[PDB]
Structure 1
Amino acid sequence: DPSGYNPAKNNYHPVEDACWKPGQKVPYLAVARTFEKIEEVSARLRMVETLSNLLRSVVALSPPDLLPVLYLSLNHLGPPQQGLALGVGDGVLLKAVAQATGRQLESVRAEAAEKGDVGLVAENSRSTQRLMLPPPPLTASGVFSKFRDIARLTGSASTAKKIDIIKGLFVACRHSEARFIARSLSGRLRLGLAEQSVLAALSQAVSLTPPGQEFPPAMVDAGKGKTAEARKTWLEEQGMILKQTFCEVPDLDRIIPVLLEHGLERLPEHCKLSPGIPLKPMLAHPTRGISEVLKRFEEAAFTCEYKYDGQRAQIHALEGGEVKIFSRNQADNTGKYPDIISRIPKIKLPSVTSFILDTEAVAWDREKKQIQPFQVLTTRKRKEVDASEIQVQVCLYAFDLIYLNGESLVREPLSRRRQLLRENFVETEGEFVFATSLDTKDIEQIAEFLEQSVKDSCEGLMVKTLDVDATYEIAKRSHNWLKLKKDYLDGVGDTLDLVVIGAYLGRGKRAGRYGGFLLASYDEDSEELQAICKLGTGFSDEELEEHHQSLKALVLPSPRPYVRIDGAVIPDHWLDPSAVWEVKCADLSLSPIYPAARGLVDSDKGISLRFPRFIRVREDKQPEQATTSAQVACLYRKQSQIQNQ
């Protein structure tokens, strides 16, 4: 019986310890039980062991069910470049849960906010899970198809249809299934296992129990002969095949059926980095100072690049002339930028037959010949733009080359790839230029360069080694670059003193306390606190608890007459304005929602904070003594990017 299933069981046996006969379909309750054991523990190694154990049975008995099981555990709907989204929000999901169970909405919405988890509410209600005799059990592939069903429906009257499908599952759910369907739909599975741990579990699972094996499979534990040391080394090198493959083709739709009929050793042969197929980009680790750079890099030579404030654009040029473009999430952004396809001609030498570029698309005002802020870039249409429409021009700032003229430049040092980029590509000012770089190790030069980038409408510096551990092999270390941001540096930075005027109930890791707060500045001339932004990162678990107790004393039934939030999300608890917190941010923005300082820099819009974080309590300060909307308008005006307008 599946409810008995224990994929966490000591010395776990794929065929004997399963809960479905071979060539049957994997049952969803198996997937739910594997989930229960994964969330029950906190070590990633144990989690990987359990998910491996389920994945091995799935390979021995129902291999067609492997792809959907993996998707179910990532909570993905498919390849990222295909663009699926469920289009179901918390409120619809709560209507779905309520109807399915027979309960009043208000009651359901209440308990969900209270427990901080919709899955818990969907589980523990089972009326009409009475009158109608139980529907057939739920299958892993079936649930994953109903998910793809929901995400597929669009247009007028689709919500009602999306709900019916969800009610379908909730009625077929038994045991712990409703908990995880509800969690998945809400995009909050919170197992404590995600992409990296799935890959680990996959490669271990096919390593221990390889596919394409005549049932009953000859070998079910290819690890038994080896000693405990020899095992761990073999596991690690197996996982790295998969990881670097996935990193070049993060697409289970391609990778998986290839694994099922060619084994893991042969995967790099059939799935290699290739234009038109987006690959995981290289990521930056935050570095809190020039001193920490030399700690992290020690003896390796490195370069310093301008960090541009636009959005990543991974430009693909295939042999045959076709041109595609992808976001850092692997989204297809090709239709987004007609203007960039037209200008592919202008950027390469005639000898260049195919490339993958790593660049930053940055809004550009040609009238004035300089960079506009991020808020401008985002006003451009998405979807399917036709070139006549384009309002906000973008300029490309290239800083890496991944694949040239048929050959894959991944294993090559940066020093190499930057040369190749500089050789075969052509700067056209205000349209496609290279990243301002300074090769150096002198701390004074590095600091002057930092202050210079910010002067030139940028966020600070990127930092990349040139030859030591300086490839593009994301699977070795994904966060292989450093970001030296201006606001990372103690003493340097916009910090504001803000008043807590509201609290929001936490979810998940924050259930039972407050997960975020509403913050305001003081406006002297209208004798009013005005909401500036929400705050939800920067406190320790202890600090966040102290805040729950100290601020519960001050919960108010309704807001003070002098509190002004306008468009912002109404808090769950209004608070007596007393508490003053020190708050740091990266930028200040013109807000469509917040009333802080409205009319002082824009007749219509107020000012907000970009990337706000809690620093500490201002025990010595009073709401009167808070940063003032006047000061918020001063801070905004002096912003480097802003003075250049």
Structure 2
Amino acid sequence: MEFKVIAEYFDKLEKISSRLQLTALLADLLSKSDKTIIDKVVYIIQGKLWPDFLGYPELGIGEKFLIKAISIATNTDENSVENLYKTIGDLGEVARRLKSKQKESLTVDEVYSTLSKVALTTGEGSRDLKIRLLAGLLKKADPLEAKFLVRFVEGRLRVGIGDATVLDAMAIAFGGGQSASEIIERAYNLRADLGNIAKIIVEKGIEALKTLKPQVGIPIRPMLAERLSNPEEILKKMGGNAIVDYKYDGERAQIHKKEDKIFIFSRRLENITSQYPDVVDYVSKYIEGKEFIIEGEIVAIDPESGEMRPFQELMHRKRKSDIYEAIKEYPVNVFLFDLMYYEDVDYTTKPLEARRKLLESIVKPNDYVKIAHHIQANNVEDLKSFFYRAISEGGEGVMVKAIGKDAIYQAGARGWLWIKLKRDYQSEMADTVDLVVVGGFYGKGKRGGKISSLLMAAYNPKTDSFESVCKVASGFSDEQLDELQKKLMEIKRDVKHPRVNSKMEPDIWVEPVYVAEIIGSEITISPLHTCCQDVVEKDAGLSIRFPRFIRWRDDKSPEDATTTDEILEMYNKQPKK
């Protein structure tokens, strides 16, 4: 197979505007290709030598060096090449012009092997080798081949075609038509290696793709998530049942292990293994299994408090020159959340509960690699509570995932099996306040011995009083709930504090000291509460509907609390319906 056919493709590509004609062009090019080297053609036509996930050096050379190569190939001095470059603005076209100004034609095979060499050659003699290699290529090239070889090496073939475009053309060229698209797409989603897929289609035919399974070392296209902002709508989609994961702000890492070698692919399926030798170490140390494909979030972590840091800190990490310095300054944890392959067995067809069960069992307990924080929600209030805990930890929100036999791993697809519930739930709980704890309530039943409900108040600066706005029981983690008893008992008072104004009687009154961030859906008129007493409705104050504890505000004194005036303001903003 001659390289001219590809140069001709590139030239035609520039002149066409029709999506139809593109498909036809590519299908033709692929079907008239040497079947033996289809796996190279599929990347060449996009301007590449190989898929990104391999982590191989990108093809490139300094421009001065390209000019040297063209100069050598065309037997024109570098100055003249330089001067033509100014007026033309593309070294490819310069190369073309200088070639057409003056017997075996280039094969795709030699172009590929030569360009691979140019990409992979490193160290001291590499400048001169790259130049010689390119010059020899450009020499053998016809004018048009030279133009597109230059562009290719420069990364200035502006093809604007991706794997999807080529998969489509492969359907047309080899699969018998558009009907082949689905089988070809499904295979690529399981094994996102265009060359691997083309090879199979060409050698064994299309039908061989139907039984295709993942191959450890080749990324699976990440399963994507739908999105909804209504927790009730989400759980209905789920059959009223779901696994709910914390949605982490980090790098979504697909982690492969084959016999001993560990690969890490980013959200974009770039090879990021070398950025995370610490993650490589955690995986090899703490994950049992010969070979596997799993997925987790790499999250930057605070070196002293271990708390999560935003994704931008991982970008800062990437910019550090010293990897050990980078790791020490920007440690990471891994929050694993799926498993798609384990010891020669494809898990993508197995239900999420089964993949998770396996995933959990293979991780030895440790401080670094953990299963995503999750629950099984069997009702919308489980989901909401968990969503609210997730964002109280500053989080994006949660990912809600179907369970059962339909809950398979849908490689590359966005559908209803995973749905993200994000902070954009800024429609329901539309109001966030800092309120003062002025009392507590014992819970009921077996926790009738523990305070599990707080009487909260807003600050009235005119009267220097705390006016009750709500009784909050939801939002407290088990740990926060347990801490309440001591926290409040320490400041228990036998009679209502004279600065606290409440008609509602808690089980214990408390010194007005502690401030909590509270969220609710809206502010409502309440006869039970004294906040803005009588201002909107007589014999009633204002209250917070469906309050949830978010967090303590240690950084606030009780007089820094949300004021009654602010409560009124928020209420007065609410639709008057």
Task: Name 1:539's counterpart in structure 2.
Answer: none
Using the alignment, how far apart are the partners of 1:129 and 1:315 within structure 2? 48
User: Are 1:474 and 2:411 an aligned pair?
Assistant: yes
- The one of 72, 80, 96 equivalent to 2:44 is 72
CA deviation map 1:185-232 (0-9, x unaligned): 233433343201212222432234xxxxxxxxxxxxxxxxxxxxxxx6
Task: Name 2:35's counterpart in structure 1.
Answer: 63
Q: Write out aligned runs for 1:213-612 (5 A).
A: 235-236=178-179, 238-251=180-193, 254-267=196-209, 272-275=213-216, 277-284=217-224, 287=227, 290=229, 294=233, 303-318=243-258, 322-328=260-266, 329=269, 331=271, 333=273, 336-337=276-277, 340-341=280-281, 344-348=284-288, 354-377=291-314, 391=328, 392-422=330-360, 425-428=363-366, 430-437=367-374, 452-466=389-403, 470-474=407-411, 486=423
Could you tell which deviates more after superposition, 182-191 or 337-346? Answer: 337-346
Amino acid corresponding to residue 431 of structure 1 in structure 2: Y
Tell me if structure 2 keeps the 8 A contact 1:69–1:141. no
Using the alignment, how far apart are the partners of 2:149 and 2:236 within structure 1? 45
Q: CA deviation at 1:155?
A: 1.1
Task: Name 1:108's counterpart in structure 2.
Answer: 85
SS at match of 1:181: helix
Over 3 Å counting, the alpha-carbon distance change for 1:420 and 1:129 in structure 2 is closer
Task: Name 2:509's counterpart in structure 1.
Answer: none
CA deviation map 1:382-423 (0-9, x unaligned): 99x999995243211011111235421111233442344345
Amino acid corresponding to residue 48 of structure 1 in structure 2: T
Using the alignment, how far apart are the partners of 1:125 and 1:334 within structure 2? 37
Measured on the aligned residues, the alpha-carbon RMSD in Å equals: 4.7
Using the alignment, how far apart are the partners of 1:185 and 1:74 within structure 2? 12
Tell me if structure 1 keeps the 8 A contact 2:255–2:265. no
Amino acid corresponding to residue 188 of structure 2 in structure 1: F
CA deviation map 1:406-453 (0-9, x unaligned): 42111123344234434554553x312222335559888767755654
Q: CA deviation at 1:455?
A: 4.3
TM-score of the pair, normalised by structure 2: 0.59
User: Are 1:199 and 2:171 an aligned pair?
Assistant: no
Tell me if structure 1 keeps the 8 A contact 2:251–2:297. yes
Using the alignment, how far apart are the partners of 2:62 and 2:420 within structure 1? 35
Task: Name 1:50's counterpart in structure 2.
Answer: 25
Using the alignment, how far apart are the partners of 2:185 and 2:149 within structure 1? 28
Using the alignment, how far apart are the partners of 2:7 and 2:404 within structure 1? 46
Q: CA deviation at 1:485?
A: 5.6
Tell me if structure 2 keeps the 8 A contact 1:94–1:109. no
Over 3 Å counting, the alpha-carbon distance change for 1:123 and 1:386 in structure 2 is closer
Using the alignment, how far apart are the partners of 2:262 and 2:306 within structure 1? 27
Over 3 Å counting, the alpha-carbon distance change for 1:124 and 1:415 in structure 2 is same
Q: Write out aligned runs for 1:152-191 (5 A).
A: 152-174=120-142, 176-191=144-159
Larger Rg: 2
CA deviation map 1:66-123 (0-9, x unaligned): 23322211333235454322352674576458746764647636753xxxxx4xx522
Tell me if structure 1 keeps the 8 A contact 2:223–2:412. no
SS at match of 2:85: helix
Tell me if structure 2 keeps the 8 A contact 1:464–1:482. yes
Over 3 Å counting, the alpha-carbon distance change for 1:285 and 1:48 in structure 2 is farther
Task: Name 1:86's counterpart in structure 2.
Answer: 58
SS at match of 1:290: coil
Using the alignment, how far apart are the partners of 1:163 and 1:38 within structure 2? 28
Using the alignment, how far apart are the partners of 2:420 and 2:370 within structure 1? 21
Over 3 Å counting, the alpha-carbon distance change for 1:30 and 1:312 in structure 2 is same
Q: CA deviation at 1:266?
A: 2.9
Using the alignment, how far apart are the partners of 1:297 and 1:160 within structure 2? 65
Unaligned runs of 5+ in 1: 1-25, 113-117, 209-231, 493-639
SS at match of 1:74: coil
Unaligned runs of 5+ in 2: 430-550, 556-577
Amino acid corresponding to residue 362 of structure 1 in structure 2: V
Task: Name 2:92's counterpart in structure 1.
Answer: 122
SS at match of 2:9: helix
> How many residue pairs get matched?
423
Amino acid corresponding to residue 346 of structure 2 in structure 1: S
Q: Percent identity?
A: 26
TM-score of the pair, normalised by structure 1: 0.54
Task: Name 1:3's counterpart in structure 2.
Answer: none
CA deviation map 1:559-600 (0-9, x unaligned): xxxxxxxxxxxxxxxxxxxxxxxxxxxxxxxxxxxxxxxxxx
SS at match of 2:206: coil
Over 3 Å counting, the alpha-carbon distance change for 1:282 and 1:184 in structure 2 is same
Task: Name 1:635's counterpart in structure 2.
Answer: none
Using the alignment, how far apart are the partners of 1:139 and 1:87 within structure 2? 19
Using the alignment, how far apart are the partners of 1:337 and 1:441 within structure 2? 39
Using the alignment, how far apart are the partners of 1:42 and 1:130 within structure 2? 27
SS at match of 1:306: strand
Using the alignment, how far apart are the partners of 2:314 and 2:53 within structure 1? 22
Q: CA deviation at 1:144?
A: 1.9
Amino acid corresponding to residue 250 of structure 2 in structure 1: G
Task: Name 2:8's counterpart in structure 1.
Answer: 33
Could you tell which deviates more after superposition, 306-315 or 449-458? Answer: 449-458
Using the alignment, how far apart are the partners of 2:236 and 2:150 within structure 1? 45
Amino acid corresponding to residue 472 of structure 1 in structure 2: Y
CA deviation map 1:104-156 (0-9, x unaligned): 647636753xxxxx4xx522565543675xx6533322222222121022112
Over 3 Å counting, the alpha-carbon distance change for 1:444 and 1:247 in structure 2 is same
Using the alignment, how far apart are the partners of 2:365 and 2:245 within structure 1? 16
Using the alignment, how far apart are the partners of 1:484 and 1:164 within structure 2? 56
Using the alignment, how far apart are the partners of 1:126 and 1:295 within structure 2? 59
Using the alignment, how far apart are the partners of 2:183 and 2:40 within structure 1? 22
Over 3 Å counting, the alpha-carbon distance change for 1:273 and 1:65 in structure 2 is closer
